[PDB]
Structure formats: structure tokens, C-alpha cells
């Protein structure tokens, strides 16, 4: 499994704005801070994998889409519209000419700011 780090290690990672994200950026080299503005229903693909989407706003009021894949029940309830989170382990991914952050079960951490 991956060594995401202790909670202290996770918060130690550099916070990046949407404008600072690039495809291929090392997934354990940064954290993303965002306020949830939208949370989709859960969906399911032909391989039985469940997934859902959120839209998050960064400190500069820019917005980005994020997608969460597999074992969604373990993460779905913690994400609430209007609340702030740190996300660690996201893949910066291109779709068309656009960027999203993709989170696959096994690779990531969510730290709610309300726990801080």
C-alpha cells in the first residue's frame, strides 16, 4: 500500500491553488484545499465500480471538478456542501482540455477543516 503519511505529514505538504496544478504532478507532493459547492449522486459503471463527483472552490474563488472512484460509501458522507477540506493524493487529470482532480480508493486522504 501507499505511504500517505501521518496526519502531521499530510498537513505539512504544500497547499496548491487550482492555478498551480499540472498534469502529472507528484500525487504526494502537495495538498489541495477546497470548499465543496456541489456533490453529485453516486453512480456505477459497467465494471460495478461506484463513483461520484464534487465541485470545489479554492482560496482564489476558482472552481474545479473532482471525481471519486470505488468504495464511495467510505468517503461520500464526510463531504458536505459549504464545508472546507484538505485533499491529499489526487491525480491531476486532463479531460478534453480541462483539468480535474481524480481520487481512486487506496490513494488518498480527506481531512475536514472542521476537525482542525
From Swiss-Prot:
> What is the stated purpose of this protein?
Single-stranded DNA (ssDNA)-binding protein that mediates the recruitment of telomerase to telomeric DNA. Telomerase is an essential ribonucleoprotein (RNP) enzyme that copies new telomeric repeats onto chromosome ends by repetitively synthesizing the short telomere-repeat sequence 5'-TTGGGG-3' using an RNA template component TER.
- Record annotation: effect of changing residue 95 to A: Abolished single-stranded telomeric DNA binding; does not affect telomerase activity of the holoenzyme telomerase ribonucleoprotein complex
What is the source species?
Answer: Tetrahymena thermophila (strain SB210)
Q: List the disulfide bonds.
A: none
The record's comment on protein family reads: Belongs to the replication factor A protein 1 family.
- Substitution effect: residue 102 to A: Reduced single-stranded telomeric DNA binding; does not affect telomerase activity of the holoenzyme telomerase ribonucleoprotein complex
Mutagenesis or variant effect for residue 43 to A: Reduced single-stranded telomeric DNA binding
The consequence of inactivating this gene is: Critically short telomeres.
Q: Which residues bind DNA?
A: 31-103
Which subcellular locations apply to this protein?
Answer: Chromosome, Telomere
Name the UniProt record assigns to this protein:
Telomeric repeat-binding subunit 1
Q: How does it assemble?
A: Component of the telomerase holoenzyme complex, composed of the catalytic core (the catalytic subunit TERT, the telomerase RNA template component TER and TAP65/p65), which is associated with two heterotrimeric subcomplexes: (i) the replication protein A (RPA)-related subcomplex, composed of TEB1, RPA2/TEB2 and RPA3/TEB3 and (ii) the CST-like subcomplex, composed of TAP75/p75, TAP45/p45 and TAP19/p19. TEB1 and the CST-like subcomplex are tethered to the catalytic core by TAP50/p50.
Amino acid at each position: 500500500n501507499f505511504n500517505i503519511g501521518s496526519l502531521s505529514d499530510q498537513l505539512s505538504k504544500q497547499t496548491l491553488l487550482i492555478s498551480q496544478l499540472q498534469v502529472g504532478k507528484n500525487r504526494f507532493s502537495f495538498k489541495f484545499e477546497g470548499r465543496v459547492v456541489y456533490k453529485s449522486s453516486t453512480f456505477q459503471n459497467q465494471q460495478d465500480s461506484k463513483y461520484f463527483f464534487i465541485t470545489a472552490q479554492d482560496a482564489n474563488n476558482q472552481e474545479i471538478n473532482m471525481s471519486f472512484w470505488q468504495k464511495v460509501d467510505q468517503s461520500y458522507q464526510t463531504l458536505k456542501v459549504g464545508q472546507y477540506y484538505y485533499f491529499i493524493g489526487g491525480e491531476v487529470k486532463q479531460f478534453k482540455n480541462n483539468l480535474e482532480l481524480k481520487f481512486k480508493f487506496g490513494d488518498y486522504q480527506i481531512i475536514p477543516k472542521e476537525t482542525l
